[PDB]
Amino acid sequence: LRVDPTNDRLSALVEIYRMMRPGEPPTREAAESLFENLFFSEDRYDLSAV
Amino acid sequence: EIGRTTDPVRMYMREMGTVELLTREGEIDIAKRIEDGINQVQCSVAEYPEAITYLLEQY
Amino acid sequence: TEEFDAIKIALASPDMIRSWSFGEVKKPETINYRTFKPERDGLFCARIFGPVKDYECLCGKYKRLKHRGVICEKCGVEVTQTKVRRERMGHIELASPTAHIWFLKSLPSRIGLLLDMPLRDIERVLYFESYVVIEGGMTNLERQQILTEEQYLDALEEFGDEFDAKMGAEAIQALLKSMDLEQECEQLREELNETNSETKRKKLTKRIKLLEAFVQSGNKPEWMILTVLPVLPPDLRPLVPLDGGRFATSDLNDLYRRVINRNNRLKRLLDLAAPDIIVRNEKRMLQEAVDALLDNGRRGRAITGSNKRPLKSLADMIKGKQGRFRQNLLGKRVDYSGRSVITVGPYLRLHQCGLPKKMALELFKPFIYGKLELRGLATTIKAAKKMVEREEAVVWDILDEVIREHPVLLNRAPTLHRLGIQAFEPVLIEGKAIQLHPLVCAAYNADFDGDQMAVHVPLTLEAQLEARALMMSTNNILSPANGEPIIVPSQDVVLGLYYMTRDCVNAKGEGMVLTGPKEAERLYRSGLASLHARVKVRITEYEKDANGELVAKTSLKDTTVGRAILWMIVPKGLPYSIVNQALGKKAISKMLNTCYRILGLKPTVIFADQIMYTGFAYAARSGASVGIDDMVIPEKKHEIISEAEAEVAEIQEQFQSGLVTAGERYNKVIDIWAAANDRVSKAMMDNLQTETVINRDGQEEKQVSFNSIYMMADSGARGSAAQIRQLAGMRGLMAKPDGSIIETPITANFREGLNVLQYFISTHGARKGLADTALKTANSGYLTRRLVDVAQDLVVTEDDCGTHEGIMMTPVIEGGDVKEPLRDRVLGRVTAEDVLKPGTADILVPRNTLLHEQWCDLLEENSVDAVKVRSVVSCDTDFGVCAHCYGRDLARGHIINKGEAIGVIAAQSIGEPGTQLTMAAAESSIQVKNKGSIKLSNVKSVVNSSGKLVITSRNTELKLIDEFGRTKESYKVPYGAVLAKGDGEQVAGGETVANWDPHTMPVITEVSGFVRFTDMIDGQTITRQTDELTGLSSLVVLDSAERTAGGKDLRPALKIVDAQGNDVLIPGTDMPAQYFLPGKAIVQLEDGVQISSGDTLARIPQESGGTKDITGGLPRVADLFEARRPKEPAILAEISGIVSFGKETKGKRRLVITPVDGSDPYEEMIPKWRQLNVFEGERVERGDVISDGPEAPHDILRLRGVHAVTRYIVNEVQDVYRLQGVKINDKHIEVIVRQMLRKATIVNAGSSDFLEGEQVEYSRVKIANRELEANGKVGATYSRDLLGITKASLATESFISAASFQETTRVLTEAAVAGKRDELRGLKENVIVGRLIPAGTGYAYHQDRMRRRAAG
Amino acid sequence: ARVTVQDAVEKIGNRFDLVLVAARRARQMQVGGKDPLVPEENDKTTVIALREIEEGLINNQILDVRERQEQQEQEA
RNA sequence: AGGUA
């Protein structure tokens, strides 16, 4: 947490969006969509029964 | 942006992101100023006789 | 037909690029799809690159050979030969200048360093991330600085029509235009004479060297930015029709199509005055496309449609592995060659091999045609072709004729050493497999289990002769890595010989008296006697004596019938004692070696063939078979297994009691099982060895068993004692994953079938072995490639140079005993000094001369401890080595012939055994195993009141002088020890001559008085653990890895002063009286204690070893040849004189050596984690260690000298090799070393830059020139530098060799920017060029060319 | 058939220019113009050159002097 | 791709 430069969801989304795609000005909606589709999209992320 | 990038796609998106989208009447206003410019150049050609002589030759 | 002495590489100019081009490629069009005629003017174009089909315009206008000197002017297409399409280059006129990727993303960026501008800045400018000022004006803006969008806009608004700044490759090219080289060179030259600041002078020197090099290259920096892009001839990027919708197209074709598309789009956009964003985007397109074309892979890959794969680029086609593809590998395919499976050739003579009739016919078709037309059986080549395809009996006699004298080369699929290719006389055989001589398969490392060998036909008469003289098997009876023969009887023939010579205790026909071995053969073949039986036979042995004359001595020998039968085979001139013995592999190899040394070549070859035939015949007559009963289980196997189970059960029970620790319990169990395994193996070997108990005449006797498996074990045919141990005994301990030895071993063998679980256990060992073999094979291949690279250009160019330098040569003793004697290491070497006898001062070895067996025997008789030997490293020859300094070894006992390539043979010799490399009473008390004179070397010891010969420092050795001059046992005495023996006292064998605690090194005082604590704070340097019983303490001097905040400002020491307080110095020792305590020196004696000479002062704790710290095998050998650091370099005393400590702990503690005379100040760094063995105020000498641990080759060469580093490398590598039983003549490692140090660093120049890494040969010829001349400029002084084999091969004089087998792109870029001009005179350079190599047969040719060059 | 070239190496100690001189001799043997000096067993030029060098008839010096004398009768 | 040394 000390190392963390962010303190809110929006800046975390910005950092995630910039690390996943270099540059790429962090549009808030784009960052939210990227984060949701990375791990919470059934058509983009799945673990299956196993 | 300056993000140790080497992809022209990325900074092309950067370039296109600077300009904001237009509306329906915005296109009409820009085309209106275009029409004003082309009318100005048409008047400039109008004050020139020789181009008009050439046009009449083709007519 | 083409003559050229050298190849120049340089920067291509746009003008000369247009000069190469025959037309401008303006369209990305390729062909007309349905009509495959190339378009105009596309990537494929007859108007540009020439016509497609032979000598006809591609318009249907001219179709004849007449129209060839005139091109078709009735249309664009020209008419020439079609091969012209393979050579004509084109050019593309780029609308915007484009940067070259090679000059950009190489680790040294030539664009970056020429502009002295960091890489990120070039990347951002070129890729249009930021602007850069291409010269300013009267602004506050520098001549060169990057500006962002808003910064550039602000500068433009603030500064009007004075501001010249662009963006991208155009800006870079403008910058290169604005930069002038010669003027800056003049400015730097002026400034250097005026400037005195160190950093300023260094900057000026670096820049002036760079600019002067660029000017000497004759290149203009603007050429780094490509304005016109050359395009490769279409034939080298072929487009060939294929069936269906698929057609073979070059990735180069698609890349050039993309480049042309983007260039044309840029041209159109510029013509349309497109917005700045779009034109910048299209320039980005062009830059990316050009970068991918030149080298796709450093820009985030480029893929094409309908195919997901990185596109091939020009760099990717050049850069290859291993080495350049088309030139050497992969793979330089060859004609007139065949391939087939090999079988045994047990009837063949050594100089011949079986070649199947069909392969012989197909291989020699031109020869068959020639001879058929010669005798006139066919009137044309076509008729001869019909005759040979009909395979009539007529052509077969022609085939026999052409084969009779023609030799053919046989080649193994992997080639590890020069014996992998050998000539043989082909013998026609019906069948389909190549029959190979059984003796030769050992050299090929080929076992007949489906191995395939290739056959090559040396066509020209010179090549036929060359194969017969050099390639021939009979000419290569000796390994190039060692004088002992390589064609040695191996397994079946060895078994037959052993059975024929091994004697029984009772058999038919014992006690008979025979004359000649002929009666022995008659008795054996008639069944009137047995093959082996003690018999007196009268035999005439011939002895080479007097001057080389045979001495016939006829007398009676007590031998066996089989031995006499063998002696029949043995050629005249050998002693009978050689065969009157049981013959294993070693015995037969030694016998062949003696036969070759005594008789010569032809008797050796004939004798080898005859012994092969005899061994095979008598092995077949032996009927040696392995049954199920010939693995007799020892009777004590169950008893030993049950016992060991009992002790391990007891140990496990005691472990549960907590009496023994888990580690100690594990070690005890492992030791118990190891003892059980040894007992079982010994019982098995006792059972099998003397299994025969049959009576000689009625009295039973124990003698060597007739058991077959014991015959193959003892004769060394196949299977050692360890091998038979897994069969008849028990296979014992193995390891599990993580490489730990399993607690419970395998108690079963292969005669008592392993159960499921034990087999599953053994599977891990099997998998590990197989994976190890694969990885070690790959690593050995890479290693031998690097050795060939570094040793490529070395060749014997002079018969003699003249030099008394060399290496001090001694039998090597590591540990406590000698494992490699003087004779073997000196055999075949040349003397460098006329060494006297160990007694009288008599010269028994004349001036520098080759040492053959007779001289080695003379040296053994008068045992001299050391011999100076001319090594290749000390040879004064340049551009090669003199014949003497190398030696004799090849395939002959004579001196090396001038022109022989020793580098390649040495590289192969060191590389080939790489597949064979898969890798108390010590330090407590020295026990001399034999009785000899005791001698101390570099000893610092004085006898004290207790008679203790306490040795100080860890640089003292204890040798063992034998009866004449030879050391036979050597040991290392650590810092602090007790010795009851003197410097001349005789010591019995196995007697403890020295002793010290295995728990700690004791510091035994050699003086008396009170102990004074110098540089002490009780709590910073030492800690209080006072346990006073008689005045003692457990004060701990903190270890020399970390200390306290006040323990890092002082060096804790114990001064010895008398009652008066005056210093009492230790006599006869460099050590001062103030013991500088190193890390963990526990101060037992407190301040104010009278110390006696013979009392411990401070103990240094240890562990009596018990931990492995030695590695070997391929990684060790590679690290030795790469001159890698050992992760803890043992720093040496780098100058003689008195030593002293400096200021303590600025992070790293400083040590100042000031010589007693001369330049005093030699302060240096020492890291605080090291364990110092240096004591301030002692007289050290250059070479003495300063800290413990392993050494690195660099400082060894730098300080102790070239000879010392050569000795170190040779000894270390030979230690790895002798560990596996492989013997290599040290001259190979010597020449490899000589190639490693071919670069030196200039201190004082003659025409150099005082720091220039320069080839030593040029430095040596320059210093010779200045010394012979009256001009002693400057100068000039040099220091030899050591580089790893990869680095040495990488920094050669010829860029072709470096670019071939190493980083091709970077080497080519460096050569181009430097404008290098390699002048050949190197094996691989001439190989790439395609002319005779300057080695061996070709050396005569090149030497002729040398005479034709530089002179009429 | 010539099993060994050691005897030839004895006459010409370099063992490399031995190849050059015997190749020159064998090429003059195969290419028309020169006639043999040692009996053959239906053998090609190579073992002929080896035998000629082995008996000392041909080395570098003899080949060179012979090419002179032949040059002088052809120039006449 | 699999297999051979």
Query: What letter does residue C192 receive in the DSSP assignment?
Result: H
CATH of domain C636-768: 1.10.132.30
Q: And the tokens for C1233?
A: 């070393």
Q: Is the CB of C781 under 7 A from strand E?
A: no
- Measured in angstroms, the resolution is 3.5
Contact C277 B16 (CB under 8 A): yes
Q: And the tokens for C667?
A: 């070690």
**Among C693, C699, C651, C701, which residue's Cα sits nearest to residue C676?**
C651
Phi, psi of C867, rounded to the nearest 5 degrees: -135, 135
Contact B5 A25 (CB under 8 A): no
Q: Give the residue carrying structure tokens 């599977």.
A: C763
| CB of C463 closer than 8 Å to CB of C343 | no
CA–CA distance, C516 with C537 (Å, rounded to integer): 6
Element at C1011 (helix H, strand E): strand C1010-1014
| CB of C919 closer than 8 Å to CB of C1219 | yes
> Nearest-CA residue of chain B relative to C284?
B8
**Burial status of residue D50 (CB atoms within 10 A of its CB: 0-12, 13-18, 19 or more):** buried
Q: Is the CB of C774 under 7 A from strand E?
A: no
Q: Give chain A positions within 8 Å (CB) of B5.
A: 22-23
Nucleotide nearest to C450 in CA–C1' terms: E5
Residue C872 neighbours by CB under 8 Å, 6+ apart: C881, C885, C886, C902, C1227, C1230, C1231, C1234
CA atoms C1153, C1159, C1161, C1163: torsion sign: negative
Q: How far is the CA of C285 from the CAs of C90, C123, C128, C293, in angstroms?
A: 21, 15, 11, 12
Q: Give chain A positions within 8 Å (CB) of B7.
A: 22
Please tell me the distance in Å from B14's CA to the nearest CA on chain A: 7
Q: And the tokens for C1179?
A: 């007289």
Residue C719 neighbours by CB under 8 Å, 6+ apart: C709, C712, C713
Beta strands C807-809 and C971-973, pairing class = unpaired
Q: Is the CB of C775 under 7 A from strand E?
A: no
CATH 1.10.10.10 describes domain C926-994: no
CA–CA distance, C131 with B21 (Å, rounded to integer): 27
CB half-sphere exposure, C308, CA atoms < 13 A = 0
Please tell me the distance in Å from C910's CA to the nearest CA on chain D: 25
Number of H helices, E strands in chain B: 3, 0
SS3 content of chain D, % helix, strand, coil (to 5): 60, 0, 40
Chains touching D (at least 3 CB pairs under 8 A) are C
Protein contacts on strand E: list nucleotides below 7 Å from a Cβ: 4-5
CA–CA distance, D2 with D5 (Å, rounded to integer): 7
Contact A22 B5 (CB under 8 A): yes
**Residue C455 CA to E4 C1' — how many Å?**
19
Query: What letter does residue C558 receive in the DSSP assignment?
Result: E
**Residue C435 CA to E5 C1' — how many Å?**
17
Contact D43 C404 (CB under 8 A): yes
Q: Nucleic chain E: which protein residues 433-492 of C have CB below 7 A from it?
A: 446-447, 449-451
Q: Is the CB of C238 under 7 A from strand E?
A: no
State whether residue B3 sits within 8 Å of chain C by CB. no
| CB of C292 closer than 8 Å to CB of C314 | no
- Show the DSSP H helices in C195-311 as ranges: 198-217, 251-271, 276-295
Count of CB atoms within 10 A of residue C205's CB? 15
Query: What letter does residue C452 receive in the DSSP assignment?
Result: E
**Residue C451 CA to E2 C1' — how many Å?**
19
Nucleotide nearest to C412 in CA–C1' terms: E5
Q: Is C292 helix (H, G, I), strand (E, B) or coil?
A: helix
Distance from chain centroid for Cα C1182: 30
Count of CB atoms within 10 A of residue C546's CB? 8
Q: Is residue C441 a known part of a binding site? A: no
CA–CA distance, C926 with C974 (Å, rounded to integer): 11
Contact A24 B11 (CB under 8 A): no
Please tell me the distance in Å from B30's CA to the nearest CA on chain A: 28
Contact B2 C129 (CB under 8 A): yes
| CB of C434 closer than 8 Å to CB of C363 | no
- Show the DSSP H helices in C1155-1302 as ranges: 1193-1195, 1202-1219, 1226-1236, 1256-1268, 1285-1290, 1295-1301
Size of interface C-D (CB pairs under 8 A): 82
Q: Is C459 helix (H, G, I), strand (E, B) or coil?
A: coil
Nucleotide nearest to C774 in CA–C1' terms: E5
CA–CA distance, A46 with B8 (Å, rounded to integer): 32
Altogether, the residues listed in chain A come to a count of 50
Q: Is residue C59 a known part of a binding site? A: yes
Residue C1309 neighbours by CB under 8 Å, 6+ apart: C102, C103, C106, C110
Please tell me the distance in Å from C57's CA to the nearest CA on chain D: 43
State whether residue B16 sits within 8 Å of chain C by CB. yes
Q: Give chain B positions within 8 Å (CB) of A22.
A: 1, 3-5, 7, 10
CA–CA distance, C926 with C949 (Å, rounded to integer): 14
Distance from chain centroid for Cα C459: 34
Contact D1 C465 (CB under 8 A): no
What residue has its CA nearest to the C1' of E5?
C451
**HEC letters along C773-799:** HHHHHHHHHHHHHHHHHHCCCCCEEEC
Please tell me the distance in Å from A49's CA to the nearest CA on chain B: 38
Q: And the tokens for C31?
A: 């062909």
CA–CA distance, C4 with C9 (Å, rounded to integer): 14
Q: And the tokens for D51?
A: 């035998």
Q: Is C1138 helix (H, G, I), strand (E, B) or coil?
A: strand
